[PDB]
């Protein structure tokens, strides 16, 4: 068994929080290290975002 | 029967060479199709059976796997094809020499 094909693959993601800037807008929010805002997706099932 | 059998040995050898050539050409032309298994005939055993007598072809072991399931290897098939062609021409020359000698005896 010599031939060994290679296929690309992507793990889930990287959860390092990004840099945040202060725009002083009254209702702009930034989460904690592992925070997630819940929204209602188009299909109806809830989803998480930042 | 005498002349018939004496020529028949080489005639059957030549026919077996031709059939093996046909099989080799088939499995070379079909060398780029998934799910195909390389086939060949045991020339020596087949000739021995025919001499005292619809051929029993058998699969060829692969040498390195391929995902699509192809087992025919082009280099080995080419070497076998060249060997078979040379054997066929050798048998042709021997048969022609025997026939020419037989004809020349009558002169």
Swiss-Prot record, chain A:
Localization per record? Bacterial flagellum basal body
Coiled coil located at which positions? none
Q: Which family does the entry's similarity section mention?
A: Belongs to the flagella basal body rod proteins family.
How the protein assembles, per its UniProt entry?
The basal body constitutes a major portion of the flagellar organelle and consists of five rings (E,L,P,S, and M) mounted on a central rod. The rod consists of about 26 subunits of FlgG in the distal portion, and FlgB, FlgC and FlgF are thought to build up the proximal portion of the rod with about 6 subunits each.
- Provide the protein name: Flagellar basal-body rod protein FlgF
Q: Which organism is it from?
A: Salmonella typhimurium (strain LT2 / SGSC1412 / ATCC 700720)
- What part of the full protein is here? 52 to 101 of 251
From Swiss-Prot, chain B:
Q: Note whether Kinase occurs among the keywords.
A: no
Q: Which GO terms describe its biological process?
A: bacterial-type flagellum-dependent cell motility
List, alphabetically, the InterPro entries matched.
Answer: Flag_bb_rod_N, Flagellar_basal_body_rod_CS, FlgB
Tell whether Membrane is among the UniProt keywords.
Answer: no
- For this UniProt record, give its keywords in alphabetical order, as a comma-separated list: Bacterial flagellum
Knockout phenotype, as recorded, reads: Defects in flagellar assembly process.
What does the sequence similarity comment in the record state about its family?
Belongs to the flagella basal body rod proteins family.
Subunit field text: The basal body constitutes a major portion of the flagellar organelle and consists of a number of rings mounted on a central rod. In Gram-negative bacteria, at least four rings, L, P, S and M are present, whereas Gram-positive bacteria lack the L and P rings. The rod consists of about 26 subunits of FlgG in the distal portion, and FlgB, FlgC and FlgF build up the proximal portion of the rod with about 6 subunits each.
Described by its record, this protein's role is as follows: Structural component of flagellum, the bacterial motility apparatus. Part of the rod structure of flagellar basal body.
Q: What is the protein named?
A: Flagellar basal body rod protein FlgB
Native source species = Salmonella typhimurium (strain LT2 / SGSC1412 / ATCC 700720)
Which taxonomic lineage does the organism of this UniProt entry have? Bacteria, Pseudomonadati, Pseudomonadota, Gammaproteobacteria, Enterobacterales
């Amino acid at each position: 068994a010599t031939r060994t094909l290679v296929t690309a693959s992507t793990p889930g993601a990287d959860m390092t929080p990004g840099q945040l800037d202060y725009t002083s807008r009254p209702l702009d929010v930034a989460l904690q290290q592992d925070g997630w805002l819940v929204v209602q997706a188009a299909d109806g099932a809830e989803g998480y975002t930042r | 029967d005498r002349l018939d059998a004496a020529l028949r040995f080489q005639q059957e050898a030549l026919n077996l060479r031709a059939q093996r050539q046909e099989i080799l050409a088939a499995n070379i032309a079909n060398a780029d199709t998934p799910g195909y298994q390389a086939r060949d005939i045991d020339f020596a055993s087949e000739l021995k059976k025919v001499m005292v007598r619809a051929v029993d072809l058998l699969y060829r072991v692969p040498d390195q796997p391929s995902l699509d399931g192809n087992t025919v290897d082009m280099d080995r098939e080419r070497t076998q094809f060249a060997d078979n062609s040379l054997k066929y021409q050798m048998g042709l020359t021997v048969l022609g020499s025997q026939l020419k000698g037989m004809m020349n005896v009558l002169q």
